Amino acid sequence: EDKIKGMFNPKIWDKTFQDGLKKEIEDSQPYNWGTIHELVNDDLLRAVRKEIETEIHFTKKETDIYRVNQSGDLANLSGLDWDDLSRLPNLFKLRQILYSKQYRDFFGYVTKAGKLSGSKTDMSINTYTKGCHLLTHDDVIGSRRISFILYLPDPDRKWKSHYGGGLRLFPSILPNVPHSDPSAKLVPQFNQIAFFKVLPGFSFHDVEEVKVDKHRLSIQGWYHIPQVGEEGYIPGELEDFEFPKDERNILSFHEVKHFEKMLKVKLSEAEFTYLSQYISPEHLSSKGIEKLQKQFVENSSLQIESFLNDDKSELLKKVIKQKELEQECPYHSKDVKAPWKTAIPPHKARYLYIDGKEYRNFQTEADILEALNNNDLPNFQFTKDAIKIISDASGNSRENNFDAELALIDLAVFHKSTIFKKYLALLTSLCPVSEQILIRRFRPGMDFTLATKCRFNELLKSNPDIIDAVLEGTLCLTPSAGWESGELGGYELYMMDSVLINDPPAWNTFNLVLRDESVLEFVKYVSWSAKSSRWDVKMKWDVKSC
Ligand SMILES: O=C(O)CNC(=O)C(=O)O
Numbered sequence: 001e002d003k004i005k006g007m008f009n010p011k012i013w014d015k016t017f018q019d020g021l022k023k024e025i026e027d028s029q030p031y032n033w034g035t036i037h038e039l040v041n042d043d044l045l046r047a048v049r050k051e052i053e054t055e056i057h058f059t060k061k062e063t064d065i066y067r068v069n070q071s072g073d074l075a076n077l078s079g080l081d082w083d084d085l086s087r088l089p090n091l092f093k094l095r096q097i098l099y100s101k102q103y104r105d106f107f108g109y110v111t112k113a114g115k116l117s118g119s120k121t122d123m124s125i126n127t128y129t130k131g132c133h134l135l136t137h138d139d140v141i142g143s144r145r146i147s148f149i150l151y152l153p154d155p156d157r158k159w160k161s162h163y164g165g166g167l168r169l170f171p172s173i174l175p176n177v178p179h180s181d182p183s184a185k186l187v188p189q190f191n192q193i194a195f196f197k198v199l200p201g202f203s204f205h206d207v208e209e210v211k212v213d214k215h216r217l218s219i220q221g222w223y224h225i226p227q228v229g230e231e232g233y234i235p236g237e238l239e240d241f242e243f244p245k246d247e248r249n250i251l252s253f254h255e256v257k258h259f260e261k262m263l264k265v266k267l268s269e270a271e272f273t274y275l276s277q278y279i280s281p282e283h284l285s286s287k288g289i290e291k292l293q294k295q296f297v298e299n300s301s302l303q304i305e306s307f308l309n310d311d312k313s314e315l316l317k318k319v320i321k322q323k324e325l326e327q328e329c330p331y332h333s334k335d336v337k338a339p340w341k342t343a344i345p346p347h348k349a350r351y352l353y354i355d356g357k358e359y360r361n362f363q364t365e366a367d368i369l370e371a372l373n374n375n376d377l378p379n380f381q382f383t384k385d386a387i388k389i390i391s392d393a394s395g396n397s398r399e400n401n402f403d404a405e406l407a408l409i410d411l412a413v414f415h416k417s418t419i420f421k422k423y424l425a426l427l428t429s430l431c432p433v434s435e436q437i438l439i440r441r442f443r444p445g446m447d448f449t450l451a452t453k454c455r456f457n458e459l460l461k462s463n464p465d466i467i468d469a470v471l472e473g474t475l476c477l478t479p480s481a482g483w484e485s486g487e488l489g490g491y492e493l494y495m496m497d498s499v500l501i502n503d504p505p506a507w508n509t510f511n512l513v514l515r516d517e518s519v520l521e522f523v524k525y526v527s528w529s530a531k532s533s534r535w536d537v538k539m540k541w542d543v544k545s546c
């Protein structure tokens, strides 16, 4: 109770230091946070790190939102018991002082956070190694009031920026709508502490993938609202911003009646000729269709390899490989030009896409609000029009050309066709009544989606003929190697609310799934070390039975 303050850098007890830091936090951007260098008695934090290395057993865990080496899974034996620190006397001593009344009075003062629990200790020990990463979130959970992270990388070697592993902070386009791109990045050093008041809809942050083979050791923790009466405490003393929307447009009367008349290999020579512009002969033949109809009835899932025929396989691979290798892919949302859009918000997803709508770039509230007041629909042929006219001005350089976008839009127009939707209904024996089609590109080190359910159309809920499901399709057009372990991410993951599908990115595949209310999907975050983007074509349809 006396030697506590002495286990800190004496500067934090200095009134001048305190009042100076308080203001630094008040006026910080993009939301109120702060950092202190050399927080703790160096020989202690050195003792603590030698303890963690000696005694604690880290276990990789990957989910949609992170990959991190964890020590916290209790009910795994290796799980760290904070109720038993017999062999981590210096860690015990660390927790004691971070939650001391001495430190809490300081730390609460500078952060204008009010009272902070000393009895509700809440700490965890993680390492991030090559590939590890934690996507965007605001920390808003239960009674967390202030977040803090104490860094213990190798104390005798400075952590470098190109290592990755940075604390990134996202600014607010408007509340619960953080800008896709981070506006500040903290390269952590030993005995450094990052911290912020937990703020619903604002404190969005992440941990940049660790790119090299080093060990980023941290102690994340939280200060909580006091227990009721603790040191005198008394209590009390959006889908509209998601882009793309998970919406489909109903099909014409022409289209639907076709799929009905058919279901109540009945395609013409002509229709088969159309379908074979794009689809491999192997999936147009009688045997090949019975083979797929059977699969679908059994699994309510198709996973087709070599979907497209070789003419279109060679074409797409070429133009996709050309763009990968000879053009500057944009790595900030401001840089994305027509026909591409950046999916937002980053605590839900981040990827590049073509939706055939008029061009949006969302840097401001007014950008989001201008689009909401002016909802507009896809038109791919007009999108092609727009591109050629831009692509004539500049000149179709090895570096500036739109060949990929044009081949892919052509592929989307195929899949938009009446006839494909006939072929589809033939495969599945379902009548599509709606569609949404997207071209998606997931960039190394930036793009991901997160585990979500399908979204039923509210207007068609009361319809007995429409299946309480969503038919979802994914044509993957990723031409690079090394995805196969999951290690690079990019994989399409279908699981239940146990895993239905787990397909790393591959070339010219087509997955097809009928999702009921409860199925979760996500494309995993793509590693910085991936050798290309994941390219694909996402297709969603409401369906009805015939
Ligand atoms: O280690 C870091 O810098 C960030 N950690 C977190 O944001 C978290 O654990 O929720």
Ligand SMILES: [Mn+2]
Residues within 6 Å of the ligand: 137, 138, 139, 147, 205
């Ligand atoms: Mn966090």
